[PDB]
Amino acid sequence: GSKPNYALKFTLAGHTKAVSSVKFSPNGEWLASSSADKLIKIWGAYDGKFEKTISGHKLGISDVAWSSDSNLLVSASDDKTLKIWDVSSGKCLKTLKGHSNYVFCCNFNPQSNLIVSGSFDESVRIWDVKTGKCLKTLPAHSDPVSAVHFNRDGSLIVSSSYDGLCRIWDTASGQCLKTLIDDDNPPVSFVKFSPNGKYILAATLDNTLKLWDYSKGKCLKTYTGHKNEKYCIFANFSVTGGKWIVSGSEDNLVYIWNLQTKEIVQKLQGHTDVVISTACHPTENIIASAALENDKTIKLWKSDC
């Protein structure tokens, strides 16, 4: 109960370069993986069964995100585009063009009528899904944008940058609501809202995770013990069993913390390169983890708690 007991169930091989992200569909039936090999792969969430490859990007992919109804994906690519995909058909519906450098991060709003993107071009863009047109270009940061995420009602966007800032944006106007983290340094490598939209989980490249109260703009919790000085490693709120914080690490482990106590409650051993990305199953106590170039595999882990 008080600790999870995640154990390896499946290893998913198929990517020929570093995996860049993994995401479970909201309906829980699929895992989507993006890679430097320019491919998206779709896997059975429960049995890790390879479903299909989705291809079309001309260069490597840094991120993929699911629509709310689990019917679409958006990918962010070094080819300076995002692509919206129909998962069923595997077809590119739209190519989102406007970024002037690598597109690093992406997400749909809960309504799934918008996509938010972050680029090496230091901008955040908001896209209309239906038309594939850019609605707003936000001069968000003074260095590459590491993460973008909408809160639970779609009214807010949180961004992070190598400029060391975390900023929250009014979706409707694109105007800045507050700069949460305002330090020269270190680089903010990842941010996302908590499921209730009250808190922001932020990674910094000083081996630190911080849980911020958005309203008060104050740090509540710090999570340490893992290695993170180079890569934009995802972090998750695990909510299906015990309330954990989950992250990859440059020491090739998955770290699990107790959200409240900040104690490490498990380290998952198995990968042979940096764990860049972790995802938590929406219903079951299942973690997916993905590793860089030496490894190029995705691991599915299952816990009783």
179, burial (CB in 10 Å: exposed 0-12, middle 13-18, buried 19+): exposed
Q: How far is the CB of 166 from ligand OJJ (least distance, A)?
A: 12
If binding is defined by CB under 6 A, does position 20 make contact with ligand OJJ? yes
Among 33, 62, 204, 228, interactor with ligand OJJ by CB under 6 A:
62
Q: How far is the CB of 119 from ligand OJJ (least distance, A)?
A: 11
CB 103 within 8 A of CB 95: no
If binding is defined by CB under 6 A, does position 147 make contact with ligand OJJ? yes
Binding mask 217-256 for ligand OJJ (x = CB under 6 A): --------------xx-x----------------------
Q: How far is the CB of 13 from ligand OJJ (least distance, A)?
A: 17
Among 72, 73, 74, 105, interactor with ligand OJJ by CB under 6 A:
105
For ligand OJJ, the binding residues in 175-214 under the rule CB under 6 A are 190
If binding is defined by CB under 6 A, does position 18 make contact with ligand OJJ? yes
Q: How far is the CB of 190 from ligand OJJ (least distance, A)?
A: 5
Q: Please choose, out of 16-24, 64-72, 108-116, 130-138, the segment that lies near ligand OJJ by the rule CB under 6 A.
A: 16-24
* Distance (Å, whole) CA 192 – CA 118: 13
Instruction: Tell whether the torsion through CA atoms of 154, 132, 69 and 79 is positive or negative.
Output: negative
Q: How far is the CB of 305 from ligand OJJ (least distance, A)?
A: 27
Q: How far is the CB of 162 from ligand OJJ (least distance, A)?
A: 8
Quote the tokens at residue 146. Answer: 């590491």
Sheet holding 208-213, edge to edge: 188-193, 199-204, 208-213, 218-223
- Upstream peptide bond of 4 is cis (omega within 30 degrees of 0): no
Among 37, 63, 163, 295, interactor with ligand OJJ by CB under 6 A:
63
Q: Please choose, out of 13-21, 176-184, 244-252, 295-303, the segment that lies near ligand OJJ by the rule CB under 6 A.
A: 13-21
Instruction: Please tell me what DSSP assigns to residue 30.
Output: E
Q: What distances in angstroms separate CA 264 from CA 86, 92, 220, 239, 273, one per listed residue? A: 39, 41, 17, 16, 21
Amino acid at 19: V
If binding is defined by CB under 6 A, does position 116 make contact with ligand OJJ? no
Beta bridge partners of 182: 165
SS3 state at 181: strand
Among 156, 165, 292, 298, interactor with ligand OJJ by CB under 6 A:
292
The β-bridge relationship of strands 40-44 and 30-35 is antiparallel
Token pair 């370069």: residue: 17
For ligand OJJ, the binding residues (CB under 6 A) are 18, 20-21, 36, 62-63, 104-105, 146-147, 190, 231-232, 234, 276, 292-293
